[PDB]
Amino acid sequence: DKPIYTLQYGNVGFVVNPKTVNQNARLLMGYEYFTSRTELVNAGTIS
Amino acid sequence: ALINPQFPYAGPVPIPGPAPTETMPLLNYRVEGRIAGIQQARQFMPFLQGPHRAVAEQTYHAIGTGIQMGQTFNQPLINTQEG
Predict the structure, then answer these.
(1) Assembly and partners (chain A)?
(2) Integer-rounded Cα radius of gyration of chain A
(3) Which residue, A26, A35, A27, A46, is CA-closest to A3?
(4) For residues A33 and A6, is the Cβ–Cβ distance under 8 A?
(5) What is the DSSP annotation of B17-74?
(6) CB spacing of A36 vs B61 below 8 angstroms
(7) Looking at residue A9, what DSSP letter applies?
(8) Which of A5, A8, A11, A41 is best to mutate for the B interface (most B CBs within 10 A)?
(9) Helices (H) and strands (E) in chain A — how many of each?
(10) First CA to last CA across chain A, in angstroms?
């Protein structure tokens, strides 16, 4: 309903404060997002 | 100031004063000063004169292409009511 949209890089972050960290720990992130590409209005065909 | 008669304040510091020195002289300074090292026209900085973008706008390029092609299915004929 209110997508994370920073206008500046990193204005917003996802946070995880771990209690225990094993060897080779990592966070695998997955994102769904919208972003603008471009449109024009022309075509032709004659036969 | 108060003066009190008959003990009056001396009418001056008088002539019994001890001239202690003739060291009164400041010798004028005479000097020639030259600050002449070769100057090179340039200074290096990390950045001068830039007005950096705080946010950019979104920007884009554009394309279209294709042709006009179609597969269609139509409504059947119907009895005409009036007219």
Answers:
(1) Homotrimer.
(2) 21
(3) A35
(4) no
(5) ---------PPPP-------PPPPS----S--S----SSPPP----------------
(6) no
(7) T
(8) A8
(9) 0, 0
(10) 49
